[PDB]
């Protein structure tokens with residue numbers, strides 16, 4: 352039941368490591384999961400619905416990890432505080448590069464994927480802005496850009512830059528250098544008076 | 546001859562305003578250009594080759610404008626200097642949103658589009674890094690991140706953030722606010738000691 356479902360999901364994750372969703376059939380997923388094709392269809396209406404589940408699970412994992420960090424004060428300087436938050440995404444999405452990458456490609460063709468991504472990006476930007484505003488309220492950060500516009504561009508930079516690194520794009524920051532790169536830009540732009 | 550070609554190109558640009566390349570046929574392009582379908586094929590081998598030409602023209606327009614700025618010293622402060630350079634992209638790509646957007650969608654399916662984009666991104670990042678290094682050499686900017694890794698993330702942020710704004714994505718910075726947003730992040734991260 353649920354473990355034929357977890358098997359379709361594990362199969363899809365495993366196959367997405369080697370080729371795109373376009374190069375994977377429902378039959379590929381069925382065979383890997385040790386089930387027939389009509390049995391696959393009891394669990395998922397399509398291969399696109401398989402990706403959506405996987406992406407949904409990854410995005411919620413990142414989100415829960417961010418909630419956990421938030422509910423636990425966390426004892427260090429401002430630069431390290433930002434580093435820890437960015438690290439959630441670096442580690443969560445870096446542990447699921449194939450799914451995370453397939454989600455981006457699916458955004459153009461799947462309104463549900465686009466909607467799911469858009470929902471979490473809004474949540475993450477809103478929370479980023481709320482922290483910047485808190486930092487501004489305690490007098491730790493100057494009131495420069497609107498917090499929400501600042502949060503939007505910084506989260507969009509991370510989306511694109513971690514994606515480039517994880518996909519091995521030309522150009523891209525080496526994955527062993529990208530965390531430090533993003534933390535620098537976030538801290539100087541959030542605390543920089545100019 | 547060349548003006549049947551400019552007509553196929555103008556037609557493609559005009560139609561890409563209303564729908565994606567997937568929703569446009571060679572016949573659509575032929576009819577708009579006032580030529581038959583086999584005549585289209587004398588000018589371009591495909592509709593994908595039409596997009597490549599358009600994108601190539603836009604990317605070279607941005608590049609030439611950046612070269613022009615570079616060869617002309619340009620008389621103002623550092624913040625305004627960065628603003629002028631970012632403005633090249635804001636204005637060039639903002640004057641060609643449909644082509645510029647279709648190029649991004651094509652990167653996944655067209656190795657020539659991916660290669661063209663990748664080439665210019667490398668050039669633009671290299672030039673960004675050379676300016677940061679010059680700024681560092683005159684003692685105007687601190688030696689923080691490697692200049693090339695800094696330039697990479699900043700150009701990737703602009704790519705993604707101007708794209709989001711021009712495509713009206715949720716989320717996105719309003720197009721009337723995005724220039725100021727990006728200039729802030731570039732100037733604070735390039736000049737910020739922390």
Ligand SMILES: Cc1ccc(-n2nc3ccc(NC(=O)COc4ccccc4C)cc3n2)cc1
Nearest residue numbers: 436437440444451452475479506509510513514
């Ligand atoms: C292949 C791929 C790789 C990475 C992404 N991606 N999408 C992202 C969206 C937001 C994001 N955000 C961050 O890294 C930092 O977010 C923080 C930090 C501190 C407090 C709050 C937040 C949201 C990283 C992201 N990375 C998307 C696709």
Ligand SMILES: Cc1ccc(-n2nc3ccc(NC(=O)COc4ccccc4C)cc3n2)cc1
Nearest residue numbers: 630631634638645646669673700703704707708
């Ligand atoms: C739809 C769409 C919209 C915009 C882009 N895009 N791609 C970009 C790549 C680089 C880029 N760069 C900049 O804005 C700033 O670049 C500077 C500034 C000063 C000196 C040198 C450079 C390269 C903007 C870009 N915008 C791509 C697609």
